[PDB]
């Protein structure tokens, strides 16, 4: 298939041009729940580097991207920085995968694992 990120970028544009920022419209157009369009679009709002943490962009779920996007709203810098962190780690041969990535990214905001 095509990753959420991809789907997201596409939706986002049709949203902006073809439908003047009206979700419902785009949703009807694509014939799919509004939520989906939301999840994908928010996923595409994620910094390139974060997507880069995954072997294939398709490994970032519409659902996790969305969750991620929201969790880091007004914290893009933080996200970016913590991302390069994880990049440097796998640059050092460390190997995490999908589910582990999104969890690592998030740990930062949590007093818990932090």
């Amino acid at each position: 298939p095509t990753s959420a990120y991809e789907r997201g970028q596409r939706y986002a544009s049709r949203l902006q041009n073809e439908f003047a920022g009206n979700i419902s419209a785009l949703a009807d157009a694509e014939n799919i729940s509004r939520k989906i369009i939301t999840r994908c679009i928010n996923t595409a709002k994620l910094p390139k580097s974060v997507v880069a943490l995954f072997s294939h962009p398709g490994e970032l779920s519409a659902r996790s991207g969305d969750a991620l996007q929201k969790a880091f709203t007004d914290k893009e810098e933080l996200l970016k920085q913590q991302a390069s962190n994880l990049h440097e780690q796998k640059k050092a041969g460390v190997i995490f995968e999908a589910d582990e990535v999104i969890t690592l990214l998030t740990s930062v905001l949590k007093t818990s694992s932090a």
Copy 2:
């Protein structure tokens, strides 16, 4: 004695104006190794949010402050985050001393979180 952090702010200024940014010049002036000036100054670069995690700024060594600074270079936000996270642990009465603080702060950069 005065804290590395403090010393750092002093060295820092003297550097910018009084010596056109020549560590060597400053060093000779203060009659001390260059490295010391370096270390303290980098310590002073740390977010006041971090110095706060310590009972007294003197608890933060020139040495560790320096290491901390180099470690979080280009990652000041991340640092600040971890800082606040820690601020809460103690907000909740939790307590750790000097050494632990620096380890916890730095921990975010290591993989031991799961390995």
